[PDB]
Amino acid sequence: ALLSFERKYRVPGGTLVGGNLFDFWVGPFYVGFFGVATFFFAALGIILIAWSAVLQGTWNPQLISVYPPALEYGLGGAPLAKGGLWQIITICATGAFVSWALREVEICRKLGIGYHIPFAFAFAILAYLTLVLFRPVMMGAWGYAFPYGIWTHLDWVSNTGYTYGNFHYNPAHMIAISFFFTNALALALHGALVLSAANPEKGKEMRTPDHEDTFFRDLVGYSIGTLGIHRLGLLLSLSAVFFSALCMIITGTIWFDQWVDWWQWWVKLPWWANIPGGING
Amino acid sequence: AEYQNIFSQVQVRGPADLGMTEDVNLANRSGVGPFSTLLGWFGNAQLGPIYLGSLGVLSLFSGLMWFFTIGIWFWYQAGWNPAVFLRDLFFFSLEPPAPEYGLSFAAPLKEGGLWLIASFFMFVAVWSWWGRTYLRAQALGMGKHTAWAFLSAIWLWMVLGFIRPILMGSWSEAVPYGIFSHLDWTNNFSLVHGNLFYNPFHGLSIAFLYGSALLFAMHGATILAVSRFGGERELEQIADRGTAAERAALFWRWTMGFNATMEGIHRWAIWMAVLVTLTGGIGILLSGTVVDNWYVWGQNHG
Amino acid sequence: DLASLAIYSFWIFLAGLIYYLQTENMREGYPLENEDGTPAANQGPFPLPKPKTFILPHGRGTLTVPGPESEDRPIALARTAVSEGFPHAPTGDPMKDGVGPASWVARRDLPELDGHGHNKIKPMKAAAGFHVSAGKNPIGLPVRGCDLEIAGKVVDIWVDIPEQMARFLEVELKDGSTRLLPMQMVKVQSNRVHVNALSSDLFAGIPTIKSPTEVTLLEEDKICGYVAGGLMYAAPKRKS
Ligand code: BCL
Ligand code: BCL
Ligand code: BCL
Ligand SMILES: CC[C@H]1c2cc3[nH]c4c(c3C)C(=O)[C@H](C(=O)OC)c4c3nc(cc4[nH]c(cc(n2)[C@@H]1C)c(C(C)=O)c4C)[C@@H](C)[C@@H]3CCC(=O)OC/C=C(\C)CCC[C@H](C)CCC[C@H](C)CCCC(C)C
Numbered sequence A: 001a002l003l004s005f006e007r008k009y010r011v012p013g014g015t016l017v018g019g020n021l022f023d024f025w026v027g028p029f030y031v032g033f034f035g036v037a038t039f040f041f042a043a044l045g046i047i048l049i050a051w052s053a054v055l056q057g058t059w060n061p062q063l064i065s066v067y068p069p070a071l072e073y074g075l076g077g078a079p080l081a082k083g084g085l086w087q088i089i090t091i092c093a094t095g096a097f098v099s100w101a102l103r104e105v106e107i108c109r110k111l112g113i114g115y116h117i118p119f120a121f122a123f124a125i126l127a128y129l130t131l132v133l134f135r136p137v138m139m140g141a142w143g144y145a146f147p148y149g150i151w152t153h154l155d156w157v158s159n160t161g162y163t164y165g166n167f168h169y170n171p172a173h174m175i176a177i178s179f180f181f182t183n184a185l186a187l188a189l190h191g192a193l194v195l196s197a198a199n200p201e202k203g204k205e206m207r208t209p210d211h212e213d214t215f216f217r218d219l220v221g222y223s224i225g226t227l228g229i230h231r232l233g234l235l236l237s238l239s240a241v242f243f244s245a246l247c248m249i250i251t252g253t254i255w256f257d258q259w260v261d262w263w264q265w266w267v268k269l270p271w272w273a274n275i276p277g278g279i280n281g
Numbered sequence B: 001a002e003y004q005n006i007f008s009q010v011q012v013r014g015p016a017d018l019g020m021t022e023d024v025n026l027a028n029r030s031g032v033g034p035f036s037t038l039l040g041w042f043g044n045a046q047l048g049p050i051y052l053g054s055l056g057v058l059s060l061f062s063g064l065m066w067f068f069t070i071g072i073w074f075w076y077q078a079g080w081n082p083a084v085f086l087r088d089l090f091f092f093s094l095e096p097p098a099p100e101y102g103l104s105f106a107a108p109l110k111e112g113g114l115w116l117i118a119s120f121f122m123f124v125a126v127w128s129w130w131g132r133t134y135l136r137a138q139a140l141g142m143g144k145h146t147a148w149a150f151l152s153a154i155w156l157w158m159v160l161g162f163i164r165p166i167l168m169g170s171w172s173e174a175v176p177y178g179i180f181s182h183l184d185w186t187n188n189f190s191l192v193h194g195n196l197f198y199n200p201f202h203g204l205s206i207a208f209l210y211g212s213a214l215l216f217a218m219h220g221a222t223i224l225a226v227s228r229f230g231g232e233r234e235l236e237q238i239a240d241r242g243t244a245a246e247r248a249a250l251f252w253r254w255t256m257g258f259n260a261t262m263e264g265i266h267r268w269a270i271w272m273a274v275l276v277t278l279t280g281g282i283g284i285l286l287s288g289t290v291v292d293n294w295y296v297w298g299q300n301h302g
Numbered sequence C: 001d002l003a004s005l006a007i008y009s010f011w012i013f014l015a016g017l018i019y020y021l022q023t024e025n026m027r028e029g030y031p032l033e034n035e036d037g038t039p040a041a042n043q044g045p046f047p048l049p050k051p052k053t054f055i056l057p058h059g060r061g062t063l064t065v066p067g068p069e070s071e072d073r074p075i076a077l078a079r080t081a082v083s084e085g086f087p088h089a090p091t092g093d094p095m096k097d098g099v100g101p102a103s104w105v106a107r108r109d110l111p112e113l114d115g116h117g118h119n120k121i122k123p124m125k126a127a128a129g130f131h132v133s134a135g136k137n138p139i140g141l142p143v144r145g146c147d148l149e150i151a152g153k154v155v156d157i158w159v160d161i162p163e164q165m166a167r168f169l170e171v172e173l174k175d176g177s178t179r180l181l182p183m184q185m186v187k188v189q190s191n192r193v194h195v196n197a198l199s200s201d202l203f204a205g206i207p208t209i210k211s212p213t214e215v216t217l218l219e220e221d222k223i224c225g226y227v228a229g230g231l232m233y234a235a236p237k238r239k240s
């Protein structure tokens, strides 16, 4: 039930709500009030998904698909079978995601550590709400949100993207991708570096962090350092998600054309909009 | 804020660190560069030294030729006009030979020959850089993890540019050198192969790309959260577990039911990242060689 | 179909990979224990990994994990329930007893060394010639607790020399002795250093180091654990 070093940490205190009433563990899991709330939103949300699977007639998980209301409903309530389950499930999921984060805060308090982890998780929640709430509301219908199904939400991605031509040309989308790529790069590098120091060549004693520094200085002339690389990883991954939400919040709200058209603020500028030749002239 | 340790409050500076010696040929290290106060807020301020040697120079050189070959072609497309060069910079493209040349190196320069030449320099630049990542580790007595991880990225690039076009029988199947044009190429590739969303190695690849952002957010944040206990000193935490490593592990155990070790999280990390391009490579490799239409292939489940 | 073959093979690979990563992450903290310290009956579906050895640099010896673990310190907690899963309450003073958020681990009572074998962390007055290169220099500033009372003044910075990083403020108390404060737990302002985790009369209980020019791994855990424990246990004096 316990790690060998765990007992000295399992003390009372740190809860935001409920004092000591939910201050306990189940196996390895800490509960707390928000553990109870998480469970309740998750339980209900999973029931509704089952209820909806019954309405759909299948129990094949890769066919099940809960869609949101038709556009004609705009932003109003819809009947359960006609988009209303989607609405309720979205409420539950939001309840669960937010509860999960506040449970993490209670755990941070009990352990005496910073709040960076639930802070970072809030961006993933922000990104979810951008797709199911912020953007649909700004466009004026729930039906612009994505369906809850394994393959159908991929169709939604595909459909939404090609609505504005090649979505590659969205400039906030370019920025987001660059952070996703750079982040994978840095994660590989960070993992490799620590392991290569802790697990050196055969016949060698364990390396020091100075070897790590020396390795990157030799390789590219700069070492960001052990604190800096963790700062960087957090920065890269949150920025990738931030620009993701950004590239969608502006799509269909303040920009309605094919994104390749955006790039003419450059092509047809004053000093050269006319000079013959090249690709555009 | 109850200070978050994202930026340093105070910077301190001392003599440049010239680095561990081990078996490094010290003849090939530069001098040290200047300190950067700007960078010092976020990470280390020291710039340099760097290590060069034969492979580094070969790699730099060969990489510059690559850049130069593309650049000169772009100037050619811009009719040697600077204004047109800047206007259309992102629309310029160096294309591979057309299909009718197959895999021959017998295409005229302005029709795919120059692409072949660029690819040759690019090919030399990357592999000699790979040799370098391997030899720097060796000279310091380190494990070869960095070289093996880099090989995973090289794999996806080899598939896109060389292995798949050879298997398809045509250089025209490779990726052009251009900002917008390799984007158009990417779009077009998916359309031609019946929607890559239904390529399962492509879905796997996306799971690890997302998974990488997930994990590095988890881990970056975890280390900052316990830096008040010196958590970022992970090598010494591996050798002699401190309350930093213990609280980090209990945070996740209590949240999620299980946890990592200070060494072990880095094994999760290296695999999460390298699986992105390992799987992606396989997915591209299979497209048009084995599977023409992923959507249709999918509806038969295989 | 070769694509089918490939995707089924990769899933086989991925399961073997996960099993590897999980066992590899069981090198610390296992076997699991009952709350009375005896081995738990249910140890999970993954076996303990076979031992591996690190050869530590600078003659510091070898480390083999997994291996038999102790806390190697008395733990002043009482069980609060007959059943499994409830909090263990401090029996004494948790700040001083080092439990909960105030815990420390019995790390080696030796300083960490850099690559060259020198102490990794040094007071800046002993480090030629480090100096403050940007930001507010905190030397000579007053240090204030959460009770808004002055606890002492900053007399030096302890620097991580290879990383060229400030890690501790050394603070002189009214009685003339000094204490180390983790740089991460302080807020340097224009006219003072503010410390939220501690009231001014709790600074004295920060553990002391036995050498005025070096700090050991054991001491850093004791210092950091005690200061961080203030957030939970010194909250009553954290001014309305
Ligand atoms: C044909 C399709 C179009 C296109 C159309 C779109 C559209 C449309 C969108 C994107 C968006 C994105 N695209 Mg695009 N895209 C294209 C091509 C590309 C290419 C490429 C190689 O060509 C790349 C690299 C990308 C990359 C990306 C990212 C920048 C971004 C998705 C990440 C994200 O938002 O995460 C954000 C993270 C989340 C949503 C995760 C939230 C998780 C929540 C909080 C918690 C879940 C808990 C879970 C249920 C619990 C289960 C627990 C149990 C224990 C199992 N696109 C083409 C041109 N792209 C999307 C975007 O930016 O969204 C904001 C988007 O909507
Ligand atoms: C981000 C921008 C787009 C989008 C674009 C894409 C694209 C494009 C792809 C996926 C893929 C997937 N997406 Mg999606 N996806 C979006 C929003 C979501 C949300 C959400 C609540 O916001 C969820 C839970 C998912 C979930 C998933 C998984 C089914 C799958 C692997 C993701 C992964 O490993 O991530 C990283 C996270 C982890 C590695 C941790 C584990 C996460 C587990 C696996 C989540 C399982 C969810 C579960 C099946 C559903 C709920 C369980 C409840 C009990 C009912 N997507 C939006 C709409 N997503 C891929 C796919 O289908 O592959 C076949 C794929 O190609
Ligand atoms: C219409 C567009 C298509 C599509 C078409 C493709 C194609 C085609 C490909 C991908 C690929 C990928 N796609 Mg897709 N993609 C779509 C939609 C998405 C969505 C989404 C939310 O909609 C997402 C998240 C993704 C995500 C992803 C990634 C998981 C994957 C790229 C991995 C990587 O790191 O490459 C970046 C890394 C590399 C290319 C390796 C580079 C290594 C070399 C050595 C670097 C050399 C550097 C050089 C020397 C120096 C250069 C400096 C520069 C000047 C900056 N795609 C839709 C369905 N996608 C790739 C893949 O693997 O697919 C299976 C791929 O080829
Ligand atoms: C912001 C940077 C990245 C990020 C960070 C991040 N995610 C995090 C954290 C952090 C720091 C956590 O602390 C937290 C965690 O505990 O992880 C172990 C979490 C987490 N990120 C998760 C998933 C996830 N993160 C993703 C992405 C990202 N996470 C970003 C890339 C994705 C992607 C890209 O698709 C996914 C799938 C979980 C593993 C976990 C949060 C777990 C949680 O919230 O649990 C409470 C909820 C439940 C137990 C179930 C609720 C069920 C619903 C009521 C019903 C289902 C609704 C849903 C809409 C169905 C739709 C599925 C279809 C789309 C297929």
Ligand SMILES: CC[C@H]1c2cc3[nH]c4c(c3C)C(=O)[C@H](C(=O)OC)c4c3nc(cc4[nH]c(cc(n2)[C@@H]1C)c(C(C)=O)c4C)[C@@H](C)[C@@H]3CCC(=O)OC/C=C(\C)CCC[C@H](C)CCC[C@H](C)CCCC(C)C
Residues within 6 Å of the ligand: A181, A182, A184, A185, A188, A189, A219, A220, B059, B060, B062, B063, B064, B066, B067, B070, B071, B072, B074, B125, B126, B127, B129, B130, B133, B146, B147, B149, B150, B151, B152, B153, B273, B274, B275, B276, B277
């Ligand atoms: C595991 C998957 C991830 C990954 C891993 C990875 N990449 C790696 C490594 C690893 C582990 C290394 O060890 C290696 C490295 O050394 O990193 C510091 C590398 C690296 N990955 C890099 C890039 C890179 N990785 C990418 C992707 C990823 N790499 C994946 C997400 C991407 C993309 C497209 O997403 C890029 C761009 C390099 C920084 C480096 C490999 C260096 C190399 O091969 O260099 C040889 C080439 C040169 C020296 C050329 C120099 C010439 C100039 C740069 C000019 C070119 C400019 C351009 C053509 C412009 C033209 C117009 C003008 C005329 C105006």
Ligand SMILES: COC1=C(OC)C(=O)C(CC=C(C)C)=C(C)C1=O
Residues within 6 Å of the ligand: A185, A186, A189, A190, A191, A193, A194, A212, A213, A216, A222, A223, A224, A225, A226, A229
């Ligand atoms: C010793 O600390 C360092 C790392 O830790 C793993 C790095 O990854 C890296 C490299 C990662 C990036 C992308 C700079 C550097 C430079 C570094 O100094």
Ligand SMILES: [Fe+2]
Residues within 6 Å of the ligand: A190, A194, A230, B219, B223, B234, B266
């Ligand atoms: Fe790390």
